Design a protein around this motif. Structure first.
Motif, PDB file in Angstrom:
ATOM      1  N   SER A 115     -40.403  86.890 -18.837  1.00 52.53           N
ATOM      2  CA  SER A 115     -40.990  86.639 -20.173  1.00 52.53           C
ATOM      3  C   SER A 115     -40.546  85.259 -20.665  1.00 52.53           C
ATOM      4  O   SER A 115     -41.396  84.481 -21.128  1.00 52.53           O
ATOM      5  CB  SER A 115     -40.621  87.713 -21.145  1.00 52.53           C
ATOM      6  N   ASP A 144     -39.241  91.761 -26.124  1.00 55.14           N
ATOM      7  CA  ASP A 144     -39.183  93.194 -25.756  1.00 55.14           C
ATOM      8  C   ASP A 144     -39.207  93.328 -24.234  1.00 55.14           C
ATOM      9  O   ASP A 144     -40.196  92.970 -23.605  1.00 55.14           O
ATOM     10  CB  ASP A 144     -40.330  93.960 -26.406  1.00 55.14           C
ATOM     11  N   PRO A 145     -38.133  93.847 -23.592  1.00 53.06           N
ATOM     12  CA  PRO A 145     -38.133  94.029 -22.139  1.00 53.06           C
ATOM     13  C   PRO A 145     -39.277  94.911 -21.614  1.00 53.06           C
ATOM     14  O   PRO A 145     -39.574  94.839 -20.425  1.00 53.06           O
ATOM     15  CB  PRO A 145     -36.773  94.687 -21.862  1.00 53.06           C
ATOM     16  N   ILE A 152     -42.522  94.960 -22.871  1.00 56.48           N
ATOM     17  CA  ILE A 152     -43.897  94.475 -23.187  1.00 56.48           C
ATOM     18  C   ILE A 152     -44.460  93.719 -21.988  1.00 56.48           C
ATOM     19  O   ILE A 152     -43.854  92.727 -21.538  1.00 56.48           O
ATOM     20  CB  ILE A 152     -43.970  93.618 -24.460  1.00 56.48           C
ATOM     21  N   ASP A 199     -47.407  88.624 -17.281  1.00 59.79           N
ATOM     22  CA  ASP A 199     -45.943  88.794 -17.397  1.00 59.79           C
ATOM     23  C   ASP A 199     -45.642  90.285 -17.236  1.00 59.79           C
ATOM     24  O   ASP A 199     -45.825  91.022 -18.206  1.00 59.79           O
ATOM     25  CB  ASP A 199     -45.488  88.265 -18.752  1.00 59.79           C
TER      26      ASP A 199
END
Ligand SMILES: */C=C/C(=O)N1CCN(c2c(C#N)c(=O)n(-c3c(C)ccnc3C(C)C)c3nc(-c4c(N)c(Cl)cc(Cl)c4F)c(Cl)cc23)CC1
Ligand SMILES: Nc1nc2c(ncn2[C@@H]2O[C@H](COP(=O)(O)OP(=O)(O)O)[C@@H](O)[C@H]2O)c(=O)[nH]1
Ligand SMILES: [Mg+2]
Length: 169
Positions: free
Chosen positions: A18, A34-35, A37, A58
């Motif tokens: 990200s 947010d890990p 998303i 991503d």
């Protein structure tokens, strides 16, 4: 129409998928993205005098079905395989990510760049030579990046586009 490249960024949780994507697209460093998303992000760039759309998934490796993830896996033309230079496990995972890509494409010859991220840190447990040797074994470029300082960030994505352009010729 301007050429579009669907690119997929893969690698272990926390390696900086990200942060690299947001630094490339938005020119800022995120620390608490947010890990969980997963989304696609786009930027119009000029690479070697040819304008193209970078269309980047991503990945966040969450279970829930996504028509978009399926589309980018099916039609995506290049992969960034990211590990962190302070995370031995994330480097050991690279074999498994490459095996996933081979299965998706039923090909040994998929455009791919190996990315060693977080090269701003002193705590380096994966050395340059180890990663260089693995990339040589795979016949792919290796780029050292820092999503924090921007070193190597454009190079990683632009190198992947050059690998796609060479593949298609
Ligand atoms: C902070 C959360 C986070 O970033 N991630 C991303 C990486 N994640 C993840 C994991 C895990 N843990 C994982 O085991 N695989 C996976 C699967 C589901 C099957 C077989 N092998 C693996 C890895 C060991 C390679 C993940 N696979 C994928 C994946 C890739 N890379 C490709 Cl090219 C195609 C498909 Cl269909 C995939 F599903 C991804 Cl994106 C993420 C995996 C966990 C959370
Ligand atoms: N020092 C440093 N930290 C980074 C770098 N890239 C990502 N991070 C940090 O590592 C954590 C995880 O990054 P993130 O991009 O969310 O990981 P992802 O799970 O692969 O998407 C965040 O706190 C980021 O700020 C980098 O190049 N250098
Ligand atoms: Mg993420």
């Amino acid at each position: 129409s301007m050429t579009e490249y669907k690119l997929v960024v893969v690698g272990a949780c926390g390696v900086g998928k990200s942060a690299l994507t947001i630094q490339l697209i938005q020119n800022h460093f995120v620390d608490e993205y947010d890990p969980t998303i997963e989304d696609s992000y786009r930027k119009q760039v000029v690479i070697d005098g040819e304008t193209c759309l970078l269309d980047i998934l991503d990945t966040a490796g969450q279970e829930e079905y996504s028509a978009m993830r399926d589309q980018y896996m099916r039609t995506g033309e290049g992969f960034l395989c990211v590990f962190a230079i302070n995370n031995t496990k994330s480097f050991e995972d690279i074999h498994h990510y490459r095996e996933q890509i081979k299965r998706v494409k039923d090909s040994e010859d998929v455009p791919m760049v190996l990315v060693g991220n977080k090269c701003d840190l002193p705590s380096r447990t994966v050395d340059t030579k180890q990663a260089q040797d693995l990339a040589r074994s795979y016949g792919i470029p290796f780029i050292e990046t820092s999503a924090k300082t921007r070193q190597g960030v454009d190079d990683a994505f632009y190198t992947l586009v050059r690998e796609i352009r060479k593949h298609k010729e």
